[PDB]
Amino acid sequence: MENFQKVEKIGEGVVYKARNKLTGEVVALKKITAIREISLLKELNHPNIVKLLDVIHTELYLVFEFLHQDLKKFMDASALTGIPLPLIKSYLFQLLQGLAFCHSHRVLHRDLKPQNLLINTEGAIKLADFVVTLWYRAPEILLGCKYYSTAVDIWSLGCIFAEMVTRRALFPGDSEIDQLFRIFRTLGTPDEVVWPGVTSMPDYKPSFPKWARQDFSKVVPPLDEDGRSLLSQMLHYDPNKRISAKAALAHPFFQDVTKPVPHLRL
């Protein structure tokens, strides 16, 4: 709309950085029943959720608060030394608060990934944007569950947690079956013992190869036992045994959480 001045295209809808030719405000402008669905999102305000400032419907643009960097760019920029654990823990804690908030309002993100988590110079991290990467997709979605729950967001976050720690994607699948098999090779092929009802899932196949589960100590070293304990609960196969965001916030891992400030090059 004529109320903004596209400053730069910051990412392919397409996201532009823009200045409100009126309020001088700089914002992120995203060019995209869905109406009222998005208006409700405009009421979902939390410090760890990128603020949806306005919805301009004209012949659909979403006006968001502008943050200078996403986690993917930050992880890439910290690949040599990695993100300090104190900061990893602070980010995980804040994202869990954001999810606890979203989930309490029966709202799911459904597609969390490093590129959708934005950070600022003060140490805050926020959930944004509530081929397409499958690396963070929960197994129940991959198995064709049509009515998945808030637990799909915990799975995705557990994945990002593992990636921040190891500096390598946990399950970099490049197809739906490769994604599923990478999860199986690491966490063990699921069965009725660990996931009641799993064999009845739409895309479950008795012909799936049976891989043995690997120890977490080999998956996210050098994360401490509290960290591995939390991650394990965030990656349970059964969406119902998977830890909720609220309970996760009470895990011993966060007993000594702080809010460090990252060093960013804007």
Ligand SMILES: Nc1nc2ccc(C(=O)c3c(F)cccc3F)cn2c1C(=O)c1ccccc1
């Ligand atoms: N500086 C920024 N401020 C914001 C504010 C909101 C969204 C936002 O809501 C959002 C979106 F609209 C689409 C995809 C991912 C998102 F996080 C993205 N950004 C950015 C980005 O730099 C960026 C990061 C990744 C992809 C594209 C732009």
